[PDB]
Design a protein around this nucleic acid. Structure first.
Length: 58
DNA sequence: AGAAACTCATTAGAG
DNA sequence: TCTCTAATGAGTTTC
């Protein structure tokens, strides 16, 4: 692949969903993919990297 | 069984 | 140059 560049609007939403959910269920993933217009792959990857970053933060 | 989604560890694209 | 983080690979869970 290349390298997606999330807009500031898209990150704001992904971080909100992250505070409420560290693991996202598929219903919510598709709901967020449709809403922000990203693929389910992008969201699934973002959460995987977001969690690895969260455990290393502290 | 097979497909999807995890973790770890790493590579490499861009502010 | 330096730092953050998207994407991929090997190997493991989960249903």
């Amino acid at each position: 692949r290349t390298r997606t560049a999330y807009t500031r609007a898209q990150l704001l939403e992904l971080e909100k969903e992250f505070l409420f959910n560290k693991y996202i269920s598929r219903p919510r993933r598709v709901e967020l993919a449709v809403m922000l217009n990203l693929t389910e792959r992008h969201i699934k990857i973002w959460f995987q990297n977001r969690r690895m970053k969260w455990k290393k933060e502290e």
